[PDB]
Amino acid sequence: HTLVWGVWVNGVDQGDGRNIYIRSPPNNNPVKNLTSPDMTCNVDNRVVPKSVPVNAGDTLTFEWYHNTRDDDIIASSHHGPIAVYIAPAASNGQGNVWVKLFEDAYNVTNSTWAVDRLITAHGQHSVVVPHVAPGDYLFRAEIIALHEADSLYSQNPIRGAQFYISCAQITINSSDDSTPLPAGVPFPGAYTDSTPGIQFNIYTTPATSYVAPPPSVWSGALGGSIAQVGDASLE
Ligand SMILES: *[C@@H]1O[C@H](CO)[C@@H](O)[C@H](O)[C@H]1NC(C)=O
Ligand SMILES: [Cu+2]
């Protein structure tokens, strides 16, 4: 169970974004129903009043939390990958629009899942803003907790992969648009019960065999990290 508090841009805290520039759900409950509209931007997808200004090449950092800011972030048990997607805001996240900017499942050297390192990073993971058209976008951060993912939700609704999905309203101001935004996958729709990385047993299967759900990261992605950028105790 985890939620986004806000974002940072180039290491500058944009402030509490909950229901302001994040389309925040009412609580930190996972989405599990792969067919639900809740997969798009979680259970309360609506336009919120603010959209954070960035430029292409900026570092945009999502900051997650559990109950309060800069707490335990997410239960240790919730091992799994992290992805970030982007879509034009005009889409409202409908259609084949979600382009993947970031994927991290499991770091072989460190022996740590993305979620494990997210905790260590005080809830913070980043993407570099791509050189798409200036305009309004949705950045959809997605944490998949796999601790009950050996079952399918569709078969057993008490279990299943858990999706912690947060859509941030971001406005790209300066960009040369050298990498126009390509089509993307639909949410709901890109993940089905037979998609790799939806059903997995993290207890018996080595993490080095885990394949995260497609799609692949777009060649226009400028990178990202799971790493603390800013200190919530100070700003
Ligand atoms: C999953 O969501 C679909 C689409 O909204 C809905 O029809 C279906 O009943 C849901 N399944 C469960 C068990 O909620
Ligand atoms: Cu949880």
Curated annotation (Swiss-Prot):
The catalytically essential N-terminal histidine His-1 is post-translationally modified by methylation to prevent protonation of the histidine side chain, and protect the critical active site of the enzyme from oxidative damage. Cu(2+) binds at residues 1, 78, 164. GO terms for molecular function: metal ion binding; monooxygenase activity. It is found in: Secreted. It comes from the Eukaryota. One of its GO terms (biological process) is cellulose catabolic process. Glycans are attached at residues 33, 110. Disulfide bonds join 41-167. Binds 1 copper ion per subunit. Lignocellulose is the most abundant polymeric composite on Earth and is a recalcitrant but promising renewable substrate for industrial biotechnology applications. Together with cellobiose dehydrogenases (CDHs) an enzymatic system capable of oxidative cellulose cleavage is formed, which increases the efficiency of cellulases and put LPMOs at focus of biofuel research. Its main location: secreted. Its cofactor is Cu(2+). Keywords: Carbohydrate metabolism, Cellulose degradation, Copper, Disulfide bond, Glycoprotein, Metal-binding, Methylation, Monooxygenase, Oxidoreductase, Polysaccharide degradation, Secreted, Signal. InterPro entries: AA9, AA9_LPMO. It catalyses: [(1->4)-beta-D-glucosyl]n+m + reduced acceptor + O2 = 4-dehydro-beta-D-glucosyl-[(1->4)-beta-D-glucosyl]n-1 + [(1->4)-beta-D-glucosyl]m + acceptor + H2O. The modification Methylhistidine is found at residue 1. The polyphenol cinnamtannin B1 contained in methanolic extract of Cinnamomum cassia (cinnamon) acts as an inhibitor of catalytic activity. Its EC number is 1.14.99.56. It is an enzyme of class 1 (oxidoreductase). Belongs to the polysaccharide monooxygenase AA9 family. Lytic polysaccharide monooxygenase (LPMO) that depolymerizes crystalline and amorphous polysaccharides via the oxidation of scissile alpha- or beta-(1-4)-glycosidic bonds, yielding C1 or C4 oxidation product. Catalysis by LPMOs requires the reduction of the active-site copper from Cu(II) to Cu(I) by a reducing agent and H(2)O(2) or O(2) as a cosubstrate. Is able to cleave phosphoric acid swollen cellulose (PASC) in the presence of a reducing agent, yielding a range of cellooligosaccharides dominated by cellobiose and cellotriose. This is AA9 family lytic polysaccharide monooxygenase A.
